[PDB]
Amino acid sequence: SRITKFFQEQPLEGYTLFSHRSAPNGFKVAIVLSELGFHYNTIFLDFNLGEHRAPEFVSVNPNARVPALIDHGMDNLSIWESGAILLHLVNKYYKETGNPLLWSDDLADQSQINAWLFFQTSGHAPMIGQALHFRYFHSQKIASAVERYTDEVRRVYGVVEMALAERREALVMELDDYPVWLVGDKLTIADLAFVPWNNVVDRIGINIKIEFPEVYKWTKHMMRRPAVIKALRG
Template sequence: MNSAEFEYYGWNTPNGQKIMIALEEVGANYHYHPIDISKGEQHTDSFRTLSPDGKIPALVHNSKTPVTLFESGAILLYLANLFPMLTGTNEQDKAKAMSWTLWQVGQLGPLAGQFGRFHATQPTNADAIKHFEALVWRCIDVMEKQLSQTRYLAGEQFTVADIAAFPWIASEQSYLQRYNLGWQEQRPALNRWAKLIAKKPSAINALGLK
């Protein structure tokens, strides 16, 4: 008999933080299984049965028939389906939340990831760093424009889309923070949004913010 409704397998990186913020936000009963990616624990056979690509996060929902998921976008959308408070209230709002979530997974995340990877492993490769930095600024500007029109990414309600993007932009583990892009000073709407989310108990609990 399982005691928790969800088993969350992750680590303190942006893709893992997303899931923990979502679970905290809905007050889910979950058990955290740390997978230390610095020690290669993501490559074990047992973890790969949950996440075939050997990457965190993964989630098991201990429903009547247990459900296993990998890929942070799939997990967030699954949770949003279970907990409507994580999406907008009408079909258009829900569609926007879904669109921005998949934008984060397909654009912001991978581009920021490559930007950080080149900074960390090939600091003399100025062309690659410049290339990915420009693409990251493009993402920042897409968000800035949206957030200068609406309170949150998908509209006036806090949704999975904000949960997906926040750790990539503003958590301590974000490459944008680590390599100090300066978006805080240069993009006021994004800064307002990041400060708003950093005050939420779910983000504070998930990220250990003070």
């Protein structure tokens, strides 16, 4: 219950992140949190000891998974889905700052960003997770099952790859080496949501540098960003 008295004298400001030393989705919030300049504690839970299943924590995230973020300033608000946490942070920053950093003050851009973000957490992350399970942890080796998800994951990358190619193509049509982004010709939580998972697809035989050119650049760019490194060391 190391989480108990952590709930009897909580901070007056700042944030407390609930992640795991390997949870890619946990890294999603770290990166965004660092990028926006928010100061935050980080509590790494141990799945094996079942800590993400203990009472005091599912009181924070009923689903009992990571990440989960306590917003101390907002009277210790609890947000749990990584996607929910990102939209909360960029919203929170735009409200305090007046500058849509990693976000957008335009409605059509927000929709396009939410689109790529929902697509990421629902069509990209889950499938990868599934691919990982059948290749490394499922109670039995079943190729058809692994192929299913690795294939789907390639379908997804093909989607983003073609998307980035059109953006590039659009840029290059500037005949009178630049980074490309999914929305608004600017980096947003739409792009950063993919990096944590992009760095792990090799464990399932997907070579981005060889298979997805525009994606390799897109992600080489994000990986070179301090915050992404400044919090990817586990």
